Structure formats: C-alpha cells, structure tokens
Write a protein that binds this DNA or RNA. Sequence first.
RNA 1: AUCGAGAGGA
DNA 2: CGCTCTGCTCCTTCTCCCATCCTCTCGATGGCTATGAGATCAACTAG
DNA 3: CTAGTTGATCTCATATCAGGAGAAGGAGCAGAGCG
Lengths: 57, 101, 62, 82, 171, 62
Amino acid sequence: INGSEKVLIAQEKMATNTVYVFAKKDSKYAYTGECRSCLENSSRPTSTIWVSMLARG
Amino acid sequence: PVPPLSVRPAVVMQGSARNQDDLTHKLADIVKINNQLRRNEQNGAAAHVIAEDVKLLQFHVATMVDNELPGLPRAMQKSGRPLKSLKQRLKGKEGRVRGNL
Amino acid sequence: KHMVDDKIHSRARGPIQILNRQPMEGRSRDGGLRFGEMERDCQIAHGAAQFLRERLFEASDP
Amino acid sequence: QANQKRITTPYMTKYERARVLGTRALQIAMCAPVMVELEGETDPLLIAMKELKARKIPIIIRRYLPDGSYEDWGVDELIISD
Amino acid sequence: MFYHISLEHEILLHPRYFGPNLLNTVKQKLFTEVEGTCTGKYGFVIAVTTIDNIGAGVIQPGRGFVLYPVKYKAIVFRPFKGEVVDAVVTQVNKVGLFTEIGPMSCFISRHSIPSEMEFDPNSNPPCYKTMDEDIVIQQDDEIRLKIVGTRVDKNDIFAIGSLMDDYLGLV
Amino acid sequence: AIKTRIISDGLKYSLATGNWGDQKKAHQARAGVSQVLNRLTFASTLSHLRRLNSPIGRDGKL
RNA sequence: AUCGAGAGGA
DNA sequence: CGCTCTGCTCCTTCTCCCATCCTCTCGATGGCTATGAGATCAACTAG
DNA sequence: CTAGTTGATCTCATATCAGGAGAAGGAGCAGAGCG
C-alpha cells in the first residue's frame, strides 16, 4: 500500500456459537453462560447472549 | 478568557499552510456560536432555538476546558481525532506539571 | 541492528520546542535528554538544590 | 536571637561546605581577592578549598530555624570535617 | 520644598569590589547612583545627607553579586499644588514667561497671568509692563508665584505656576 | 451513482494505517492490525508474517 | 513541522 | 398515634490512577464563503 | 491654507471480554422520641 509493505497480524478472539460457562468472583451472578452468536455468513456483529444464575443472597 | 498566541501557537507546516492549535479551533467554535446566539437574541428567533444555541455554547466551553465529560460527545476535529482541551494539557503524565515542570 | 553510532547523541544549546521553550525530543531533532521526575527526586535526596535548579530551570527553559 | 547562645550545630554541614565552596569559587572566578597564598593554582575550586582549609573564606552562613529566626555563623567559626 | 527624609535602596556589588575596603565602595556607589537622580513620588533629591545603616550583604545564589540594602538620609524637593514660592525670572516671551525654581524651570502662560501685564517685545529687554508701567517683570527678576501643576517626564519633574492670586508679584 | 472511492480508499487507508475500521471512527477503531513488514532479516520477515495477536490490551496486568 | 499509531532497546 | 429525625446498610454513579528513559518508521494533516455601495479619513497632488 | 483625487478601512445587504479503589448521593428502612 503506497509502496509500503504491510502485513496483517492474525487477531485472537473468542470462538462464536459456543456456550461458555464462567463464574465471576465479584459479580451479582454466581455462574454465567455466554454465547457470542453469529450467523454463518457474517452480516452483523457477534450478538452475545448471557444466561446467568443470581448469586445466593 | 481567550489565551494569547503563545499558549496556542499557529505552527507553519513545510509549505505555507499555517495549522492552528486545538484551542484556536475550539475558540473559533465558541466565537461562532456566541455571535450566532447574539444575533438570534437580537433578531427573530424562537425560544427553543435560543435554548439549543445556549446548550451548544455550553458544550463548546465545557469541552474547551474539559473534553472528557462522561456521556457527552467528545469535541471533534478534522481526521476524527478529539481536541485536546486545557485539562488534558496538564491532566497527568506528559502534561505541564509532570511533563514540563 | 543496535550499533552505537546510531545511538550516541549530545546536546549543548540546540533547538527548542515551540509551545514550551524546552529542548526538542530525539537524536533526529537534536533534542535534549529528559531530566524526569525520578531524576528530580534523586537530586532532592542528594540535596543538590543548585544542580536541581540548573537542570530544571536554567538548562531547560529560563 | 541571642548570638551569645546559638543552638545549631558547631559543624559545617556537607551542604554548607558544598554551597560555600561553590559560591567562593564563583567569587574567585569573578576576580575577587584571594585570602590565602597561592603557589600555582588557577582553578577557582582549588583556591576555594584552600581558603576553606585555611579557614579564610569571607562568608557568613545564615541558618534559618523552623520558628523563623536565624543564626549567623562565620565559615571560620564552624568545624570543617571533610 | 526642602526636606530631610530617610530612604531605602538595595544595590548589587561585583566580587571584584570585595577587597580590603568594601563599605566605602558601597557608599560611593550609592552616591554615584542617587546623587542628582529624580523620582516622581519623592520628588527630586538635591543630595544624600548621611548613610545610616548598611544591611547584611546577601550573596545571590548562582550569581557572584552581593546585594546590600542601604538606608540613607537624603534631602528632597517636592513642589505642591497651592504652594507659594519665590522664583527667579529667566526668559520673557510672547508665548509665556519662564522662571527657574532651583533645578526646575516653570512656564507661566499669559492666560494665567493677569491681563494688566502687557507684552512688550519692542522694549530692549523683553519685559512685562502694566498700563502705568510701575511693576516691571523682566529677565533675572525675583517674583513670587503659586505652583498649580506638576508634571514628570523621563522621571524629571517640571512645574507650572500662576501669578493671578493676590500679593503674588515682584519682590 | 457508484463513487468507487469508498471501497478503494477504505481498504487502502485501513491497511496503510492499521486502524481497523472506518476512517471516521478513528478512535473506536482498533490499531495494530496491518503493521509494516519487518525487512531487517529473513527471520524477522517470516516471523512477522506468522505473527498472532491477543487483543487483551497491554495495559491489563492480569 | 505537529499529532497519532506501530515496532523496538534497557 | 402518626410524624419527624435521624443514622445504618446496599447500591449506584463517578472519577481518579495505572515505572522510567531512549530509538526508529509510517499515515494524516492541507480550509476556501462572494460582491457591491456609502462613508470617513488620511495621505498625496495640484493649486 | 484648499480642493481634488486616491487608497485603506469599516459598515450593511441579499441569499436557508481479563480494572480497581475510594468518595459522595441516594434510597429503603428500623427505630427512637415525642407532641
């Protein structure tokens, strides 16, 4: 580009369409299951859906 | 108070194009809206129009002295970079106090 | 790649920045070296008040 | 403050020695008379150190106290250690 | 007005003048500094009378100089509005009359002078004379005046006087 | 109707600067993509071409 | 020249 | 017998800070509205 | 001194995700006086 050799660096990201159950120590939720969902042929950003459990008390 | 030219130097580029400081661009916005409000109060203008003009003048002055107001939009400039207000000029590291004194 | 000739630099009353009339930054700009906050603290501990004033007032931007 | 009773140390501090030597060296460099004899010394710092060793520096150290008063000590009145 | 006032000053001294005689050098430097000087607030200083005190000389750090604060008795001259003083006439002209009060030279316009004293450029000495030609105000004469205005230029005071008030005339 | 400068200048700008996103959103855009190829030695070029990046943020101290 | 970004050195 | 005045707790904003110094490349940055008439004034250009 | 001409200078028109930690406000509320 404009005589300058430019190299694209591969960028890490969490995989999509997979359910990942984490547990944040400092939060109102005990457990949270997230899913960054994205249609096969991308047209919009990743729509993250969370399904959490409220912490006891 | 509009500062002197030393606080906002107009640096000349390689050619003759004199680039103005962020403070000068912001003062240009402030003077524009101030004159606009002055004429709108002097001549025909609706109350809501004057209110919008006063709101924009408030935004310009606030973003001149402090640009990182939570929630509000950042005062923009050409190339999509936010302006450096008087507060960022001396806020922390690489400011006046820590970075030049 | 790190050869000393590309790193050696010296200054004695060279160009200064426009906004604050202090030495420039870099070898390429013939700039001066930064006498930072930690250097100020070191010289305060030394008790060298005139050297501290020379570095932070007289050798930078009188 | 009563000069008959000065409460500060009778020793010259390292900072007092440093500043007195620098000041007197500048004075010598600006063509002030020298109080000691000189063999071949031309560096003002060497002359100032010779004057300090000889106790012949015409300077008074005004040491300020936290309360606001001060005590005046002649360089010949203080004990030079280093 | 002649007066005798104590005044304060501070003067720097180079290291060359430390020497075996120091107080004398500060004294003479003060004299050469404020002898014949003039200030608008204390008026003109005719001379310095006597040096009262020579404060402790403080060595300025980073500079070889030493500043000595001096207190000295000096006699000043300050003209005042409404004051009456005897003056000596020096020049007569159709624009006005010039008289010297000590170091100052004051000019009086014909408008301020009473209309009785005519111009007389035809006289051999330029002089002011009345209808009767009794009073004669010419060069080198001694005449009383009332100082009405004062003006300082380049730190030098120049006064203005009036001859209108009664009993202000030739001595 | 087709002002071709959108696609052309967009891809060119993004690869030229590394700010990965629209040129107007120059602060919401994430930089460090599309770096200048390192041509100092053949190993540096190969490694730069096989480089991966975890965009966790260098400021993060976890 | 300025600003930013990036790559590095200790 | 219902009102006030606390002052405790739980949450919510909100705002501040995030080592020092040094070298280099590389991209972006550029701000231009118009036109005409009336009037004053201050400087030449003759008188 | 007196007009007359000529520039400058100014005024007026017409367009529409892997932070944290502390401080301050606020709200719900338990309870104590107390008229």
